[PDB]
From a paper:
Importantly, upon incubation with 3C protease, hDisp1NNN-3C was quantitatively cleaved into a larger band and two smaller bands, similar to purified hDisp1NNN; this indicates that our hDisp1NNN-3C construct is suitable for generating pure hDisp1 in either cleaved and uncleaved state. We solved the structure of uncleaved hDisp1NNN-3C at overall resolution of 3.61 Å, and the structure of hDisp1NNN-3C-cleaved at 3.68 Å. A comparison between the structures of hDisp1NNN-3C and hDisp1NNN-3C-cleaved reveals conformational shifts of the two ECDs, whereas the TMDs remain largely unchanged. After proteolytic cleavage, the two ECDs turn outwardly, away from each other, by approximately 2–3 Å, leading to a more open conformation of the extracellular surface of hDisp1. Additionally, density peaks for the C-loop in ECD1 were observed in the map of hDisp1NNN-3C-cleaved, enabling us to build 6 residues (residues 279–284) in the C-loop. The resolved C-loop is moved away from ECD2 in hDisp1NNN-3C-cleaved, suggesting that the uncleaved C-loop perhaps restricts the motions of the two ECDs, and that proteolytic cleavage allows them to move away from each other. Four N-linked glycosylation sites were identified in both hDisp1 structures, Asn363 and Asn476 on ECD1, and Asn836 and Asn917 on ECD2, which, in turn, validated sequence assignment. Similar to the sterol-like molecules seen in the reported Ptch1 cryo-EM structures, we observed several sterol-like molecules in the transmembrane domain (TMD) of both our hDisp1 structures; we assigned these molecules to the sterol detergent, cholesteryl hemisuccinate (CHS), which was used for protein purification. In contrast to other RND proteins, such as Ptch123,25,26, in which the ECDs are close together, the two ECDs in hDisp1NNN-3C and hDisp1NNN-3C-cleaved are splayed apart, exhibiting an open conformation, as previously reported for dDisp and hDisp132,33.
Author numbering:
A (entry chain D): 181 to 263
B (entry chain E): 279 to 389, 400 to 661, 687 to 865, 873 to 1144
Write the structure that this text describes.
């Protein structure tokens, strides 16, 4: 493309800025802007044979017992109808 | 307003006990190195009641009728005023000072009473009754640090206590930000007799964001400086402006490609720093193209512009792509770490550099060809600058590097071996040693980091707090299987889901096997006997012990029941096991788990252990390794043998440390492999490849050694820096190696001066521009900028010096026929 950037510089310098500006506009419109509130939102390993178990054991706690149909892991509750 | 009376109304009362939940300030006086004097105490209490008892505070205890005061202050001055019962802290007579001095002297040897709750009465026996209501104990355990009243110093000697503390009756929390955002941040300290050093309002992480916005003037200034320097190299302002706009647009389109095309949605913090890095990178490409342009335009000037453009592309694209792709692969190699932040920063920076290379290849020739279109002293100074630069980088530098030619070898070999020994054996880099709750995220002189690092070990109620001695528990689970579901790769930090398995506990063999497992585990060495936990252990044991009654339906059976008794009697039993003791159990109790249907789904046992909880690496590693090696002995029935291999304690810091220690090494390996491969493929001469590898190793070892000597941990940043350094090293070796080859001179001492004179200007300009673009981050507040700036300066000034001296003084041994690589 040596000849292309020889006799036609302005078209190659304008297509670039067209692409750049449409990219900037899409990137500022479509996706949700970042937060920047918690400086340590990422520092936690994932899937290392000892982080999987921690994640699962923490999910086991958040799904605790509810007075009825906890959709979770409760204690005895579901058989308290005798009273 | 906030105008009411205070608590001291000639009433010998007191609000509460000074706890850890409140807000703390730390005072040091001056070089005088003493606080026991009326000016110090009075000024301390005054700056207290001025800088914190002025702003309207609606968050308070409100235990009395005073709406703007519940406790007076909780300071040393109040505790002096309660002696001799002078109500106002302002009224001190300088004799109660001597009184409390003598009292603390005569009583400090007994430090030892917790509290005397009854008014003017002591509940338990105390050695002395001359002490007031918890005065000496509180004033020794909370307010004054350890050096005061030590038994090490002899009698008649007066201590110094260079540090004191001061509490506040309000409760620490995010609400303090306003208080801090107007009254504390601007002004230096109090007057020259008392100076605040440490603050613990508890807003160290929530306020962080703000400082970010307040410290973006240092990046901007940096950009400006770069522009200036580029004007000196290429005189046309047009090219400078267009290449800076190309860099910015590259970052923008890289963000766009990052967010929606690659489609993963999480933007970490460190990604911001990326910009700075690229500011010291992209410009380099220009300083390779433009220069070459002129050379071609100096060889065949009468030719058509198209031919010159084709020739300069032919002569520049190879090296541009080599260096850009090498740095990009060095960044992308972080995609093998298990953390999230670096696993995203890698991809982002890599895409940024690649797109920047593409734009430097396309956009830049366009603008350089479209650039076809009292001042005598202002032109003569530039002419003299050009002449001096030419005569330096053409005749002086080769002379300096080649005439000595032997001191450099020994000197740099000594530096390399010193760096190797200082990174490998004695002071090897250390893993992190601070709880995940408080990382050093500010400057190392901010009033928050002081209290969070230095002063949290001088005060008793924090040192004994460091003396926790909490054992480590082990747990076992048979209900669920370990599996992660929500976005593992390029994660979201919001992906989790629970699941189930298929096992039965009704099999009597499984019951007997669980009982045998418990009995066996009660035998090993990593066990700790308490003889106090009844239900907070194996449930089967206490269940069996509970089922010894009769005439109630089942009773008085063997151990392996027929499971129709078992499934119903578990529920029959726990509803009365809750009665005796442990009336409450909340989602972390060794009791078995149930479902919507009352069947059993998850069984969880728990035990204590003898290893104490710590933060070191070897201890926790030994614990985990040996205990998991033992637990791996299952050999059990078909059920509960699958989804069996379970073990989990409060060990997360160890996970972070292990993931760092593996990711850094894997990334280093991958990046150095790519670097050596690219150097070999671009040189086509094995001896030059060996010299380049030696230079890369030298610069890596020296920079990492200087980093560790200066004193650096591996939090999350250095885990990327250690890999970025070996990618940013070869940038100069590639250029010096390509230029050395294809030179019209066969001899050894010749053709070195050629390459050096031809590319020394470009290398020096790139080095200087990255140096000065990283040197405008040193004064700042957020830490990442300072870390990155220091690393940038220290890596560029080292890599340039090595790749010039230790390479040219080495590449002159090669023989003119050499190897020339394999035969393609
Ligand atoms: C308009 C926005 C969206 C983009 C701007 C970036 C480029 C497309 C601009 C920046 C500077 C412009 C140049 C500024 C000046 C000139 C000189 C102009 O010719 C003259 O002024 C000749 C005068 C004479 O010799 O008599 C021809 C267009 C050109 C090359 C312009 C071409 C378009 C350029 C490169
Ligand atoms: C040496 C260089 C040239 C190698 C190639 C570099 C990049 C082009 C590669 C490296 C790793 C790749 C990534 C590996 C894994 C993923 C996750 C993957 O995630 C999903 O598909 C989940 C979201 C969805 O369902 O769409 C999307 C593609 C992506 C970002 C890949 C995009 C292309 C990347 C950045
Ligand atoms: C490459 C870096 C070193 C400098 C160039 C980029 C910064 C100038 C930009 C990048 C992201 C920007 C931030 C993106 C979002 C926000 C949140 C925004 O929040 C509000 O307006 C208040 C409400 C809220 O978000 O809670 C304040 C500006 C701030 C911090 C921005 C400040 C300017 C920042 C740090
Ligand atoms: C891959 C290239 C480009 C970089 C250099 C890598 C290796 C030559 C070195 C660098 C750091 C070295 C490590 C530094 C420290 C240690 C700890 C050392 O064990 C100790 O406890 C040593 C200190 C002590 O006795 O307390 C065992 C070797 C090891 C893993 C070393 C293994 C070899 C390593 C990885
Ligand atoms: C050449 C580049 C890659 C830099 C050198 C690598 C360092 C940044 C890292 C990578 C691996 C790390 C090592 C990984 C494992 C260990 C073992 C670890 O052992 C213990 O916990 C203590 C043992 C004892 O005290 O006997 C001590 C830190 C150390 C040597 C680490 C020291 C710092 C190292 C060498
Ligand atoms: C291109 C060249 C000049 C690069 C540097 C070469 C050597 C100076 C390096 C390369 C490999 C290094 C070794 C890599 C790994 C180790 C193991 C490391 O750990 C132990 O041997 C443990 C000793 C202990 O128990 O204290 C000690 C340093 C050592 C020998 C290193 C010493 C320095 C070595 C020989
Ligand atoms: C010919 C030239 C270009 C060779 C390279 C020199 C500098 C670019 C570097 C190489 C080694 C660096 C030094 C490596 C180690 C230290 C010690 C370091 O010491 C401390 O911070 C604390 C020391 C301690 O108490 O142990 C201060 C920086 C300094 C002098 C560094 C300053 C910058 C130096 C001289
Ligand atoms: C590129 C040409 C012009 C040669 C430049 C030589 C010196 C002017 C440079 C070479 C290495 C530089 C040093 C590299 C690193 C450091 C550590 C740096 O440490 C800190 O400021 C600590 C920051 C922190 O960790 O909080 C202080 C400046 C210093 C000594 C630099 C001072 C300026 C030095 C000596
Ligand atoms: C303080 O108490 C003592 C004894 O209880 C009393 O004699 C003295 O008058 C009190 N102080 C004041 C200012 O009244
Ligand atoms: C700090 O500023 C105050 C004025 O707010 C001044 O009185 C004091 O002397 C200053 N201290 C130092 C060390 O500059
Ligand atoms: C466990 O208890 C003692 C102490 O180790 C030992 O002698 C005994 O044989 C062990 N019992 C079982 C069932 O392993
Ligand atoms: C038990 O769960 C099943 C699920 O299919 C449901 O149909 C049934 O109603 C549940 N029984 C009780 C008592 O909740």
């Amino acid at each position: 493309y040596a000849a292309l950037i020889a006799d036609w510089p302005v078209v190659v310098l304008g297509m670039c800025t067209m692409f750049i500006v449409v990219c900037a506009l899409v990137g500022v419109l479509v996706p949700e802007l970042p937060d920047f509130s918690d400086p340590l939102l990422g520092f936690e390993p994932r899937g290392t044979a000892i982080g999987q178990r921690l994640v699962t054991w923490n999910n086991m706690v958040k799904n605790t017992g509810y007075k009825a149909t906890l959709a979770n892991y409760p204690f005895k509750y579901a058989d308290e109808q005798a009273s | 307003g906030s105008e009411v009376d205070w608590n001291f109304h000639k009433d010998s009362f007191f609000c509460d006990v000074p706890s850890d939940r409140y807000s703390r300030v730390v005072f040091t006086s001056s070089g005088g190195e003493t606080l026991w004097n009326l000016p110090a105490i009075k000024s301390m209490c005054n700056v207290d009641n001025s800088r914190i008892r002025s702003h309207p505070q609606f968050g308070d205890l409100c235990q009395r009728t005073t709406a703007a005061s519940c406790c007076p202050s909780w300071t040393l001055g109040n505790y002096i005023a309660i002696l001799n019962n002078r109500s106002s802290c302002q009224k001190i007579v300088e004799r109660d000072v001597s009184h409390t001095l003598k009292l603390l002297r005569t009583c400090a040897k007994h430090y030892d009473m917790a509290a005397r709750r009854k008014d003017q009465l002591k509940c338990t026996n105390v050695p002395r009754k001359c002490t007031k209501y918890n005065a000496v104990y509180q004033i020794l355990h909370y307010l004054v640090d350890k050096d005061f009243m030590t038994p090490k110093t002899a009698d008649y000697a007066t201590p110094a206590l260079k540090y004191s503390m001061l509490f506040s009756p309000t409760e620490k929390g995010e609400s303090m930000m306003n208080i801090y955002l107007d009254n504390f941040e601007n002004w230096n300290s109090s007057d020259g007799v008392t100076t605040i050093t440490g603050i613990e309002f508890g807003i160290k992480h929530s306020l962080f964001q703000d400082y970010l916005l307040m410290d973006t003037v240092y990046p901007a200034i940096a950009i400006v400086i770069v522009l200036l320097v580029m004007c000196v190299y290429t005189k046309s302002m047009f090219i400078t402006l267009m290449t800076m706009f190309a860099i910015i647009s590259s970052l923008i389109v890289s963000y766009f490609l990052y967010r929606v095309v690659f489609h993963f949605e999480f933007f970490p913090f460190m990604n911001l720093t990326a910009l700075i890095i690229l500011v010291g990178i992209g410009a380099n490409n220009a300083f390779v193209l433009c220069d070459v342009w002129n050379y071609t335009k100096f060889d065949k000037p009468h030719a058509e512009t198209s031919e010159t453009v084709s020739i300069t592309l032919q002569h520049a694209a190879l090296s541009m792509f080599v260096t850009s792709f090498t740095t990009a692969a060095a960044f992308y190699a972080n995609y093998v770490s298990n953390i999230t932040a670096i696993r995203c920063f890698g991809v982002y920076a890599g895409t940024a550099i690649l797109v920047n290379y593409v734009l430097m290849v396309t956009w830049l020739p366009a603008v350089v060809v479209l650039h076809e279109r009292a001042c005598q002293k202002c032109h003569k100074v530039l002419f003299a600058i050009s002449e001096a630069s030419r005569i330096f980088f053409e005749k002086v530098l080769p002379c300096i590097v080649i005439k000595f030619r032997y001191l450099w070898l020994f000197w740099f070999l000594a530096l390399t071996v010193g760096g190797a020994y200082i990174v490998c054996i004695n002071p090897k880099m250390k893993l992190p040693s601070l709880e995940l709750s408080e990382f050093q995220v500010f400057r190392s002189s901010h009033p928050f980091e002081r209290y969070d690092a230095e002063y949290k070990k001088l005060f008793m109620f924090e040192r004994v707090h460091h003396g926790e001695e909490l054992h480590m528990p082990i747990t076992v689970i048979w209900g669920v299987s370990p599996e992660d579901n929500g976005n593992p790769l390029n994660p979201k930090s919001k992906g989790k889901l629970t699941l189930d398995s298929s096992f039965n506990i009704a099999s009597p063999a499984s019951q007997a096997w669980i009982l045998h497992f418990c009995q066996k585990l009660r035998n090993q060495t990593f066990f700790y006997q308490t003889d106090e936990q009844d239900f907070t252990s194996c449930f089967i044991e206490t269940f069996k012990q509970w089922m010894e009654n009769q005439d109630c339906c089942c009773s008085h059976w063997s151990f392996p029941y027929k499971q129709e008794i078992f499934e119903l009697c578990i529920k029959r039993a726990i509803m009365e096991l809750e009665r005796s003791t442990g009336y409450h159990l909340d989602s972390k109790t060794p009791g078995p788990r149930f479902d919507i249907n009352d069947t059993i789904r998850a069984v969880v046992l728990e035990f204590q252990s003898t290893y104490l909880f710590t933060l070191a690496y070897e201890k926790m590693h030994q614990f985990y390794k040996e205990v998991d090696s033992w637990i791996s002995s299952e050999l059990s029935s078909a059920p509960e043998g699958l989804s069996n291999g379970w073990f989990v304690s409060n060990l997360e810091f160890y996970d972070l440390q292990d993931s760092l220690s593996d990711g850094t090494l894997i990334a280093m390996g991958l990046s150095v492999a790519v670097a050596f491969s690219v150097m070999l493929l671009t040189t086509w001469n094995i001896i030059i490849s060996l010299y380049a590898i030696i230079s890369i190793a030298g610069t890596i070892f020296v920079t990492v050694g200087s980093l560790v000597l200066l004193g650096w941990e591996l939090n999350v940043l250095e885990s990327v820096t250690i890999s970025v350094a070996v990618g940013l090293s070869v940038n100069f070796a590639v250029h010096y190696g390509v230029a050395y080859r294809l030179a019209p001179d066969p001899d050894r001492e010749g053709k070195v001066i050629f390459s050096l004179s031809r590319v020394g200007s470009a290398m020096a300009m790139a080095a200087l521009t990255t140096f000065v673009a990283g040197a405008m981050m040193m004064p700042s507040t957020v830490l990442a900028y300072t870390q990155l700036g220091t690393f940038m300066m220290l890596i560029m000034c080292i890599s340039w010096a090595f790749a010039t001296f230790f390479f040219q003084c080495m590449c002159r041994c090669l023989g003119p026929q050499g190897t020339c690589g394999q035969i393609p």
